[model samples]
Target: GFCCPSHWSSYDRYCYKVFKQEMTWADAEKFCTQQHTGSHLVSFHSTEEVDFVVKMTHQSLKSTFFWIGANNIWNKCNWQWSDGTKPEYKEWHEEFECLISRTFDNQWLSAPCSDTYSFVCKFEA
Candidate 1:
């Protein structure tokens, strides 16, 4: 597991600036794509990649907090890729989908679009 945490501050595929700026999840995702020359990474091919990133970035092992490339704003959970490749594959969890119910954490909630949080972004090597 290797990542240039010092020189390369942006996310692996998407270049996002992480801060407690306070933005809704959807808004944050859109902001990432808009900021990085229209590049973003929200999809995870496998949990192994997530673990690899955690190891490289030295993220908290106990922290199960990380963003993914999935949103259900419109209806379907169709996936996307910032690298400009078609999402030929996708794996959806049973309870993971865009939900307007703010009562439950399982159901995705809509927060202010400008609210910022730790996010993922991408850029070409």
Candidate 2:
């Protein structure tokens, strides 16, 4: 049992922080790693988490795009989060084909790691 900083949103046993600053996927990971101890790009494990992100994105007009932790850069179509966890649930836009490119919407898409976008980070509380 633990609590997160006031600026972070607590969900289950984790603390989530959404940053609107744009950065590449690699840069975002680096930022998360340095932002606080044990922080990394947010990794969703439930449909509820995915829905929450969708709603949050819809509510924030300026940040239509945000980088999540999943990517297939290490191997084609083999997605894994930056935190070294495999996703058990996923919500990808129907148009997505895992083609190793940037995503337009909130759903999962194969993005070029070098493309810049706002991102969310999470840590264990």
Candidate 3:
């Protein structure tokens, strides 16, 4: 068992920290790397995690959007988590396939990587 930082929230053995500062997707990715070991833009594998994010957002940020770790840059339309985990749960918009961005509703949507937004980072807890 482990503990998360004071500012991070723990759930399902994972520690999540949402950064309120807005930054481009690339910069956000880099920022996560610098935060701590194993820290990276969050990758969701279940509805529980997604719902947790939604509640966290609503309770804290009160914002509509955030950047997640999924993308299909090199192999267009083949979305995969930056952590290299294959998506096992599906909440993405079927109509548009590619870049992954999350909303306060816990749904994922396609958007350009260049889009700037606050982001969440996750690490083992």
Candidate 4:
């Protein structure tokens, strides 16, 4: 079994933390990485995980679209997770043509990394 720190909430083998400070997409991912070595902005894996985020997000911050890990920051055709994993699941809201964020409805959309938004971090153990 793995354990998340007191600052984060756990689900399955991953730990999540909601950061309400509106930060640029790139900065948000940077913040997550600072929290834990490999931590990154959360990327959806399934409907349940998306719902899990919906519940968690609504509980604390009825926040708007938040920064997420899914992006094509480096290559337009290579959209992927900031965690360096292939995107196994994707739900689009609409794009800065690079960065991605989760909408109020739990779907993801491309956005400008320049836009600041609340974000969630995910660390798997």
Candidate 5:
């Protein structure tokens, strides 16, 4: 009976829901956690997952960019997901920014942590 909650969409094993509210990086992460226990800002592991996210944004709430969970603000050299795990995939557009953002065209770009954008929340169902 394990299932994703309402407003969340299921992929392989995780639930994802995009929030339209604009928020800075730190606030965005905090918002996701507040949605449900164990929930965090969206993180992807492969090109397939990346494609899924792109489709989700387009098929649902379209946006120029969405905040993903990766950030190198602390380490500056090592970017990790919100859960503190090393990402198995990297599809960066450019380097040297603090927070990660997903573009509508299915590309990854880093941006200032203070920049506000809509974000997707993720959790295992």
Candidate 6:
């Protein structure tokens, strides 16, 4: 295993950081998608997936944070999964083309696509 000092966890086929990575949200999404079958993380259909991800990443109940395949910053309000699944989420806001949010805040907002942070990207082990 790689030395993930951050100790990010894998959910399904996707591994991620519970804390916001240093990359701007759009780049984060792009990073995941570029490395995966397409781009970004996919949707969740069970609590097990969420719980496993939370525990595997060692996320805190008091400070939750994770990224999903949800964004509307550079295009329309369409929120489609990076893996081409039918999107289950909504716009979650208005006048926001590129949406970005953190798990702790749980608030989606607009942001530029180039901001850098400790982003999460994945490949097979």
Q: Each candidate: what lDDT?
A: 0.43, 0.70, 0.78, 0.78, 0.79, 0.48
Query: On residues 1-125, what C-alpha lDDT tens digit does candidate 3 reach at each position?
Result: 79898989999999998888987777888899999899989988999899997788667674567888876554455778999988889776543223454555767876667767888899998
- Regarding lDDT, does 4 or 6 come out ahead? 4
Put down candidate 2 lDDT per residue, 1-125, tens digits, no spaces.
89998877777788887787888787788899998899988888886776665565555537566777765444446778999998888876533211121223435656666667888788999
- lDDT per residue for candidate 6 within 2-105, as digits (tens), equals 43224645555555544344555666766666654533553444666545554543344343344445555455545568899866666644443433334444
Write model 1 residue lDDT over 7-107, tens digit each, in one string.
Answer: 33434443323322334567656766776454564444555444444443334223223343455544454556889876677564433243221111222
Better of 1 and 2 by TM-score: 2
Judge candidate 6 at residue 34 and give its lDDT.
65
**Candidate 4 collision pairs:** 95-110
lDDT of 4 by residue, 30-117 (tens): 8999998669999888888888876787677765677778665544566779899988897765444434545456666666777778
Greater-TM-score candidate between 4 and 5? 5
List TM-scores for all candidates, in order.
Answer: 0.43, 0.69, 0.76, 0.74, 0.75, 0.42
For residue 41, model 5's alpha carbon misses the true position, in angstroms, by 0.6
Name the TM-score of candidate 6: 0.42
Which pairs clash inside model 3? none
Runs off by more than 4 Å, candidate 6 = 1-20, 59-63, 73-125
In TM-score terms, candidate 2 sits at 0.69
Better of 5 and 6 by lDDT: 5
- Listed per candidate, the RMSD to the true structure in angstroms reads 11.8, 10.3, 9.3, 9.3, 9.2, 9.7
User: What's the lDDT of the predicted structure labeled candidate 3?
Assistant: 0.78
Instruction: Report the lDDT tens digits of candidate 5 across residue range 26-119.
Output: 8899999999998999988888887887788767665678889976554466778999899898777653344455646657877777778888
Candidates ranked, most accurate by lDDT first: 5, 3, 4, 2, 6, 1
- Model 6: C-alpha RMSD to truth? 9.7
